[PDB]
């Protein structure tokens, strides 16, 4: 089978999401980290080990050395990227990827030599019978219905603006913007000291990334929300913690999603999120631009906010013409919306002649990924 006997690996922009197909929720998610203790000796608290990867490495960080395989959303090193693939297949799931076809993701703008590198890894070391290379952009759009429209990739890494027309994406419109959710959490840190609250460990700095998606909310019309904050409305919240540090928010409730449209709070001259949305559609074909406005889809970890659908609607109408019917399609889950699209593509009625198998890899090498 492949409805349940196929694996959906969604290698995100900082988190790996593995799990069998057919479900609407991934099995095991954790941040993609590896850890190397450079020498041996005694190991206390955990087992004597030459390499802590995954969940045993997240409990020991000032004990270990840290390494991110996914920086700026693109794989920078291929040794530790396979080490997490070794960790997800055999330790957190414990199934052999030698009989089950494996569905893995990629970046929309990665080179073909990187795309040939990941085909060489899955066939030789894991011995998969078949696989398929799919962009993360087409999976989130397929979970939103038909395969036409533009998706707003804003994860932990680099924002992608990929317009897709009926399953085929545009070559010269994949715009790369350096706005990231890690920049906004660092932006929240440099205005928390103005309140007077600081840090002493890295563990207190970790929960700011949780508070960025939990406590901070999107207000429709950020511009009066700071005007009502100028007249001292009730918008200051103070979250309580078990230890003595009390992290509060003031006007930083609405400002970390306001930094998406206003990058001057981040300290740069770059385009806003609605601007790189508008700049991508402004170089498409003029007849398919109407099909892109009515199928705007939000996805990622930075976009995890309540009330963000109508805020993106009112922001795009000032640049787009007023005769276009624009609809922001906001799913309830969007970090995992790429994973549910990879599972419904796995449960397609016909996927058997699209398999990249071991036989064609032996006959044409890793250039069969060109398809």
């Amino acid at each position: 089978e492949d409805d349940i006997a196929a694996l959906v690996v969604d290698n995100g922009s900082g988190m790996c999401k593995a799990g069998f197909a057919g479900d609407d929720a991934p099995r095991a998610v954790f941040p993609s980290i590896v850890g190397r203790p450079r020498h041996q000796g005694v190991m206390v608290g955990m087992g004597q080990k030459d390499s802590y990867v995954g969940d045993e490495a997240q409990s020991k960080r000032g004990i270990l050395t840290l390494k991110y395989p996914i920086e700026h959303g693109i794989v920078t090193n291929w040794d530790d990227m396979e080490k997490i693939w070794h960790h997800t297949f055999y330790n957190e799931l414990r199934v052999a990827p030698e009989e089950h076809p494996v569905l893995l993701t990629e970046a929309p703008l990665n080179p073909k030599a990187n795309r040939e590198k990941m085909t060489q890894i899955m066939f030789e070391t894991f011995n998969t019978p078949a696989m398929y290379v799919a962009i993360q952009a087409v999976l989130s759009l397929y979970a939103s219905g038909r395969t036409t429209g533009i998706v707003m990739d804003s994860g932990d890494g680099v924002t992608h603006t990929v317009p897709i027309y009926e399953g085929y994406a545009l070559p010269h419109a994949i715009l790369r913007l350096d706005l990231a959710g890690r920049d906004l959490t660092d932006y929240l840190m440099k205005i928390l000291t103005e309140r007077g609250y600081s840090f002493t460990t890295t563990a207190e700095r970790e929960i700011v990334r949780d508070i960025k998606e939990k406590l901070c909310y999107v207000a429709l019309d950020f511009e009066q929300e700071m005007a009502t904050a100028a007249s001292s409305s009730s918008l200051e919240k103070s979250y309580e913690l078990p230890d003595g540090q009390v992290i509060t928010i003031g006007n930083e409730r609405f400002r970390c999603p306001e930094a998406l449209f206003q990058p001057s709070f981040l300290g740069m001259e770059s385009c806003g999120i609605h601007e790189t949305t508008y700049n991508s559609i402004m170089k498409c074909d003029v007849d398919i631009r109407k099909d892109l406005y009515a199928n705007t889809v939000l996805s990622g970890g930075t976009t995890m906010y309540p009330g963000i659908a109508d805020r993106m609607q009112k922001e795009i109408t000032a640049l787009a013409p007023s005769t276009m019917k624009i609809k922001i399609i906001a799913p309830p889950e969007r970090k995992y919306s790429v994973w549910i699209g990879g599972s419904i593509l796995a449960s397609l009625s016909t996927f058997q002649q699209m398999w990249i198998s071991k036989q064609e890899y032996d006959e044409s090498g890793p250039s069969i990924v060109h398809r």
Binding site: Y142, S347, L348
Partner: peptide, 18 residues
């Protein structure tokens, strides 16, 4: 029986999109 019906509902939903 019921889990096979939910898998058949996901199969017909993807077949409707094909």
């Amino acid at each position: 029986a019921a889990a096979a019906a939910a898998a058949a509902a996901a199969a017909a939903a993807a077949a409707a999109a094909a």
